[PDB]
């Protein structure tokens, strides 16, 4: 639409695009950070709208805004929660680093759109006003770190942990599965003493399971709200039961354990929360890339690799079946662990009262956590669930290796067995042959003596 | 659009909205790699399509493909060029690691759309074939990397040196403006000798003039191109003057100086370049933090900071203006510096003859380059240009200063000087109040004396 | 020298020295860098061996005679008498093979000679037969790794940080009613008081605890009896919980065996989220010195809000110029083990199949970080923050020139009369009273009356 | 002990050491963890020393008598004869004045006894009066920093990277007829020489050289005569290039006074910069190190195409497992540099106004990384590149076991003909030969004729 509408604020009156819901501070955000292409991601958004939508209730329930007001307020936040309003938020993450702008855009849209709602008009002269009304008893200081934390405990909950449980099932089928079947240990790449492949399955298991536990101890610190704090964090021009009645509220709507933050000055001046949350996710990170290196190694063939394990080939050289699951987890995995260090370098830069560095602080945080959240549940689907082993392959490596000798030690000693290892490795025999060839023992002999399954 | 077109592959038969023109095999990938929200950066589509522009042309003169034939591949890719199908790349970058399947979009959609200008249709009765015709002697090994290459090096040319030499100007220009304007120095944040605002920005414009040559070094392993090595390097299947000619051609149609690379085993094999090239970006981004931070300081206020210069306010506390410009810019720089440790992770991890950690590479990397460009002409269009000294301030803060006592040691001494240095420091007095109440000078002697501008 | 072998062959050793062939050969294989293995992981290499001794004793396997002299040799590197006999680089196999073998070879020799015997090939104990019965380096250098990280973050790290936070608790209490101006974005903001401001660090701090001590149970667990790939094979059945057992008794740490064995062989994981707790505490010390030296910045031409003390000597003709050095030395550190975590996170990652081979240089950084934030607290807190002091005549002079506190006059005066006299003040260079007088909306009286800055 | 003094008053030093009042208290003050300046630096740090002395002679500021003692002691510094008298922490001031009076102190006391005096108060040449004499700690450890790097990556890292990259580049000579089965994605894929793959190393190590080159000049650049903020106050017109043209005459390098002192002394940008290329150096290496490793892998149930000396001694009953050590060290140190990276980054950035302070640490992790990175590259070289053999017989067993080569039966036979064959060996576990002859598509004779391997 051309049509423009003329909005304005302190600075003066801006052109608005008419058909959109924003006003005259988000109109001059977009014209003055035009810097690259990634703007808020949905989920903060919708983090923001509940907690708009939190702060109005509360207002009310403390008599400070009208029922009417706070209720329209109110739906207008939910139609944002419902994806009504996506294309109402245009800002770039690169803006000032409190967020204000993107809160004054959520003020901007919920007050033009909560006037509509009362029969009125959108524009200059709107029933509800966005810092007035939607932004009453609030600061953008103390309402985007808020926001912040909603969103990334919400995500984690609701995203990654499922995930995560789910993946560490399916393994552990896997591992149950292959139990009874031995495979060649590798350490250093090289090979090693044999166990199975429900052991060596056993231990991806355990990884995802410690990694679990990790993620939730990590969960309360985020947990916690600075909205009460306002400005520096004390709390000025506030009603003394607010920041504890807007927590409660919060908490009742999304049926998360959010409780207001015992110190608001570390919660103001710090990502501190997010900076240790995301170290638990840069673990899991490794751990995943370690878990996909052993699948695709594993799987490499059909004839020039290892091939112990075939997984499913989702797209359409005969056997050649990329691990393409496996590359982009592992792609991921090292995104992760970038979005550590911007992170760590954001939180470490605070500077008195407030931390200035939250846009991208949040923007690499949420993003760790889609990739991982949709990284596992796509490896699972499309790969975990159908590992399948190659026994044939598996018995004939194992049948190859040196490492069997160990079996005879207890029948013709040490001495002797060496002497076989030796042999073979020397003549690129298998150890049965070269034991034959010395006549150290019969074949029946070797058979019953070396069973790779009292490993 | 509701209404499916039934494609097909390899693999079987599968449902692509009628309206789209990509294939069967970029409908499998969308619905296999559900990961996130980052896709193909448009810069890299647009990379995409002047490659195989270029491959069609070479292939025509060599006789492998239809003037006709050649000609539609050829208009159907300006058209991408054009932006005019923006919409028909809907691939995730957390896909296989080669980009396999970003070529394979770009094959079908150029197949799809070559077919309709042949005055053919799109679907499986086309007359432009994916692989056999768009595909004709590439593959998504060679032609992946050079689509990297070819977006790298036009970015680093087009958008970020133009902006960096920009803002260098302004910085220059300020230089000279404030070359007689002494201020107080300061190291370790403490109060130290004298030097002139002009000086102090000459460091700011030697920073971006030694990062420019910098950059420019890594130029030239960028402009190498990997079309031309095939699947591992070999160049199996492809006419002997194809790596040659195909670099000339987008030399030619692009005005940057592409060269092939001389060896296509470590084009394959590695993403060297771009670690390389993305280490002095690097470089950049700690160098405008530094730029950045000074810029905030020297201009916090306005009461109770050092306040010795004053930026534009661009936004709607009197005199409180937050530094925006300045807080989306140190932002972006840790990005930066996220950025190429995911970026390294991904270029020590190639194995054998193929990097497979490609897609996330260029996501990286493309992003650093469109942040430092955007953010370098943000901050110098609505910062930079409009730096003003507070010469008040400035003077006030030099005459409070007890750093200039050094001006007197050439005239009462050392011993004397050092007295009234400690008197006024222990006092809480200025220079001039001590040495008055000590009787060691007349005023009229002082403000002879002591001359900041002969520091 | 002293003529020592092994399956190569024979090589020369200084006769002076405890070690044998294999680290002879290694001194000579991986001659990179000056890195060695900290004392920290010597010593708990040691307390592994000795562990191991008694639990190989109790259940027959090692005679008394060379259990008791294995000890003995071991407890003589615990007291630091043969720091000198470790003399290779973290560079070395990715197992900690080499260094497993240092300690084999050293506590054989000196063990010989404790039976009477003598160091060299005619040795009475075997550095592998005896020293290395029923182990691997596969499953004691993991073991090594986590007996020197929990007992360095228990011992050395946890109680700085309680001490550190100590000290600033005391300060905020002291200073709880200092009202200084509030600064966002580096611009005059709101006023809190200085003890307000001073509790944020504190709560940083309290925090950062809690997270240390949620890493400490995965750090304990013990790979010891996993042996080569993590199945056992060649070991007593109650052999790993009782030497778990036994660490746990000579150090007084809760250590356990591992619950999964091939967890515990194939990866770096509790060192890597371990590790994630120590970056964020970096962070926030970070955070902490920069707003100290700031704070401190001046003495004319900064904020100057505070003093700290002056360490270093200072030029005569310069007096007030006090560097922040402790500041700059913590900053400095912290910026350290962000680079650390990196390493520790890459070589993490980097596991195949049934090892992880990157071991030393994890360890290498994981104590150093331990290392440099236990003592970068200890160093900052009784050289700097147990000094921090407020320059109240400064703090006043700031809070009395801001235009931040006609925010109080407004409940006294329309909004708009309130900010007119503000408009004047910032327009003319005036104070907040000065333009509020000259401007006749009021008396100095009564807004000296309306503006307490006290009362937020 | 004896006692020494300064501005804050006396304080006893050992007796037996060369250093002052300043590096004691330092001592005390800075007590953090265990890096100190490294021999490199410190070397460097005396030559420093050593040339403003000439200069300052020349320029008739010193006299000859205390120029040349200075010079002297700085000789002895420079011949390994006081390696004990530098004590200091990394972690100290962030412009390295702790170091930089360390150096002062030492090269006064020691220049004294060389004049027939003594060490101590009653010394005859003094630390600041004389041998910090037209400096600042703010342009010397700058300069000492540059003098450092500079020397380190001419001297040991770029001899080092030559001698590989030729190393390598006999190996693909010698191995360029060896046809072996290309992989990608880690799958099978078509054809390459031994000798192309290798080559691939060869260029990557030639990139790599030319990279590091272009980093040189910057780092040439010296902040001596910018003085305490720059403008190079107290200091003869001619002292910043005289001093520089010294430098570049006893170290024989090619040193430049900066152009722009400001930028030289609030920044760290040439070590950024420099820095950039060896992280991107030490990428190149890791991928290196890991094809090696992975090509060796077995003896049985890996790769196993080439085998590298075994340089540890092994097991009598397993002969065959050769770890790559030599690997797992490079590999360890490559993430090393990674991290290293990140920490020099955080400093660099970190500059305020007329000074960066987060030089010690800088300088510790680039002359680290140079340390590694040189080192590394020659044990890898000496004990495993110029071993690389390949084990033919595994090489071909492997070639005419996959199915890749059915593509040069296409131009003897239809695709899906051709195809037919590689579908049956395929799912019967059969070769492309044995399928070819049991589904009769085919002779032997003219099957072996159409499969030539050599032409790709």
Redesign the interface.
């Known amino acids: 639409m051309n049509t423009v509408r003329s909005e304005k604020?302190?600075?003066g009156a801006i052109d608005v695009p008419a058909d959109k819901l924003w006003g005259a501070?988000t109109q001059?955000?977009l014209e003055?950070?035009?810097?690259?292409?990634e703007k808020m991601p949905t989920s903060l958004i919708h983090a923001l709208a509940l907690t708009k939508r939190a702060a109005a209730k509360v207002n009310e329930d403390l008599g400070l805004l009208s029922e009417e007001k706070a209720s329209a307020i109110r739906q207008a936040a939910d139609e944002v929660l419902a994806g009504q309003h996506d294309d109402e938020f245009p800002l770039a993450?690169?803006?000032?680093?409190?967020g204000?702008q993107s809160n004054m855009n959520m003020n901007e849209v919920l007050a033009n759109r909560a006037s509509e709602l009362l029969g009125g008009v959108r524009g200059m002269e709107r029933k509800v006003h966005p810092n007035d009304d939607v932004n009453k008893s609030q600061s953008s200081?103390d309402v985007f770190p808020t926001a912040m934390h909603v969103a990334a405990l919400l995500a984690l909950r609701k995203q990654l942990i499922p995930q995560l449980k789910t993946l560490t099932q399916t393994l552990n089928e896997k591992s149950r599965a292959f139990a009874d079947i031995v495979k060649?240990?590798?350490?250093?790449?090289?090979?090693?003493?044999?166990?199975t492949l429900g052991?060596?399955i056993?231990?991806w298991?355990?990884?995802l399971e410690?990694?679990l536990?990790?993620i939730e101890?990590?969960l309360p610190?985020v947990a916690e709200l600075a909205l009460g704090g306002t400005?520096?964090?004390?709390g000025?021009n506030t009603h003394p039961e607010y920041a504890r009645r807007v927590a409660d509220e919060l908490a009742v709507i999304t049926c998360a354990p959010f409780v207001t933050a015992?110190?608001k000055?570390?919660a103001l001046?710090?990502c501190?929360?997010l900076?240790?949350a995301?170290?638990?996710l840069?673990?899991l990170?490794?751990?995943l890339?370690?878990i996909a290196?052993?699948v695709?190694?594993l799987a490499?063939?059909?004839?020039?690799?290892?091939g112990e394990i075939s997984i499913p080939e989702?797209?359409?050289?005969?056997?050649?079946?990329?691990?393409?699951?496996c590359?982009?987890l592992?792609?991921?995995?090292?995104?992760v662990?970038?979005?550590?260090?911007?992170?760590?370098?954001?939180?470490?830069?605070?500077?008195?009262?407030?931390?200035?560095?939250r846009?991208?602080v949040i923007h690499?945080f949420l993003?760790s956590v889609?990739?991982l959240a949709?990284?596992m549940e796509?490896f699972n689907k499309?790969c975990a669930v159908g590992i399948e082993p190659n026994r044939?392959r598996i018995n004939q490596?194992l049948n190859?290796?040196?490492?069997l000798?160990?079996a005879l030690?207890t029948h013709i000693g040490?001495d002797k067995?060496?002497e076989i290892?030796?042999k073979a490795?020397?003549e690129?025999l298998t150890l049965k042959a070269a034991a034959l060839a010395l006549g150290y023992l019969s074949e029946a002999e070797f058979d019953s003596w070396v069973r790779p399954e009292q490993?």
Chains 1, 2 share one sequence.
């Not at 003055?32 to 292409?37: D, E, K, L, N």
């Not at 592992?330 to 995104?335: I, K, P, W, Y």
């Not at 190859?400 to 490492?403: D, G, Q």
């Open positions: 604020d302190s600075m501070q001059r955000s003055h950070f035009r810097i690259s292409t993450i690169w803006q000032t680093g409190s204000t200081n060649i240990g590798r350490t250093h790449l090289q090979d090693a003493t044999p166990l052991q060596e056993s231990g298991v355990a990884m410690h990694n536990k990790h101890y990590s610190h400005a520096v964090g004390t000025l015992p110190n000055f570390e001046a710090t501190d929360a900076v240790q995301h170290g638990a840069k673990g990170a490794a751990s890339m370690k290196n052993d695709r190694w490499s063939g059909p004839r020039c690799g290892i989702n797209e359409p050289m005969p056997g050649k079946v990329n691990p393409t699951q590359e982009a592992t792609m991921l995995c090292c995104q662990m970038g979005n550590d260090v911007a992170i760590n370098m954001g939180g470490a830069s605070g500077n008195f009262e407030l931390n200035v560095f846009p991208m690499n993003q889609r990739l949709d990284g796509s499309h044939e490596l190859e290796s040196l490492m000798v160990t030690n040490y067995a060496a290892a030796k490795h020397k690129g490993m």
